[PDB]
Amino acid sequence: TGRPEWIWLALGTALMGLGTLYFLVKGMGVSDPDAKKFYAITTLVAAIAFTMFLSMLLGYGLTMVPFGGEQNPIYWARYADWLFTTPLLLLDLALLVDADQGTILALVGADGIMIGTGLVGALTKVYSYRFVWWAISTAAMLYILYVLFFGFTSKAESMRPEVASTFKVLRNVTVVLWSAYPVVWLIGSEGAGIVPLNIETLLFMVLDVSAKVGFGLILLRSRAIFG
Numbered sequence: 061t062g063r064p065e066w067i068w069l070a071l072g073t074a075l076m077g078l079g080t081l082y083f084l085v086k087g088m089g090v091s092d093p094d095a096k097k098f099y100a101i102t103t104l105v106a107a108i109a110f111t112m113f114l115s116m117l118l119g120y121g122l123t124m125v126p127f128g129g130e131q132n133p134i135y136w137a138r139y140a141d142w143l144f145t146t147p148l149l150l151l152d153l154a155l156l157v158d159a160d161q162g163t164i165l166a167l168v169g170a171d172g173i174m175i176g177t178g179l180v181g182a183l184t185k186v187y188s189y190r191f192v193w194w195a196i197s198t199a200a201m202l203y204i205l206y207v208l209f210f211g212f213t214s215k216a217e218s219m220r221p222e223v224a225s226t227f228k229v230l231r232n233v234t235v236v237l238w239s240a241y242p243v244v245w246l247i248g249s250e251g252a253g254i255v256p257l258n259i260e261t262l263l264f265m266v267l268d269v270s271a272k273v274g275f276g277l278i279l280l281r282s283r284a285i286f287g
């Protein structure tokens with residue numbers, strides 16, 4: 061009939077909006093140039109989330125895809141958000157540990173794949189191929205999560221305990237939250253259609269807010285971002 065997911069779009073909008081504005085204000089107040097690069101990335105992550113939630117709320121970034129004999133709604137704008145915001149989040153982790161330039165290029169890379177395949181999955185009309193795309197995307201994601209868990213922690217260990225242990229909290233936050241997205245896609249409106257669209261918007265919304273504003277509040281309050 062109508063669109064019951066709207067409420068969680070509206071609450072996502074509110075939350076990314078407040079977070080964007082809060083980061084903007086704290087970021088403008090501080091003088092340290094190193095701390096600033098973190099503000100700039102993190103305020104930008106939130107701002108993009110905000111604009112994409114707000115579009116969706118207003119009914120944009122939505123398409124119908126036929127698969128399994130039905131006409132099925134898919135919010136593709138969501139992938140336009142992730143395309144930019146996930147790699148910016150990795151750049152935050154990467155600058156915290158002084159990652160080598162070519163590790164960063166690998167992650168951004170893996171990441172582009174992850175979002176690009178997720179999206180193609182979300183629009184494929186042969187039901188089983190949707191899961192082929194989904195599996196590739198999850199493979200790229202695991203690769204990310206591996207490098208953050210093995211490669212970056214080893215890097216963090218070269219840093220003062222305070223930047224290491226901030227990194228550890230953020231790594232920990234990223235691993236738990238990111239590792240849930242594939243499960244939601246698989247069981248929700250984009251995959252098996254078990255969990256309906258409203259409940260799935262809710263879940264992604266909570267993961268997104270946690271993965272960006274939650275992440276942001278942890279980083280941007282740390283002494284670790286100061287030079």
Ligand SMILES: CCCCCCCCCCCCCC(=O)OC[C@H](COP(=O)([O-])OCC[N+](C)(C)C)OC(=O)CCCCCCCCCCCCC
Pocket residue numbers: 111115119120121122137140
């Ligand atoms: C240097 C010179 C360059 C030459 C010209 C090229 C410039 C083009 C830029 C990139 C092209 C993207 C096109 C686009 O369209 O973007 C993506 C999308 C909108 O989706 P859709 O329209 O197909 O949805 C369904 C369709 N149906 C609802 C209307 C029926 O959603 C989004 O990522 C964002 C939506 C808007 C963001 C909200 C904040 C500010 C918006 C103000 C302007 C809006 C004016 C109408």
Ligand SMILES: *C/C=C(C)/C=C/C=C(C)/C=C/C1=C(C)CCCC1(C)C
Pocket residue numbers: 109142145146149174175178179194197198201238241242245267268271272
């Ligand atoms: C602010 C948004 C965040 C941190 C979003 C993270 C999203 C992912 C790690 C997405 C992962 C996906 C898969 C692993 C496979 C299927 C489709 C994707 C895009 C949802």
Ligand SMILES: CCCCCCCCO[C@@H]1O[C@H](CO)[C@@H](O)[C@H](O)[C@H]1O
Pocket residue numbers: 080081084100101103104107
């Ligand atoms: C109310 C919503 C507006 C959000 C403003 C987000 C600001 C994004 O961040 C911007 O990144 C620049 C690089 O281009 C940095 O060097 C800056 O400090 C900043 O202008």
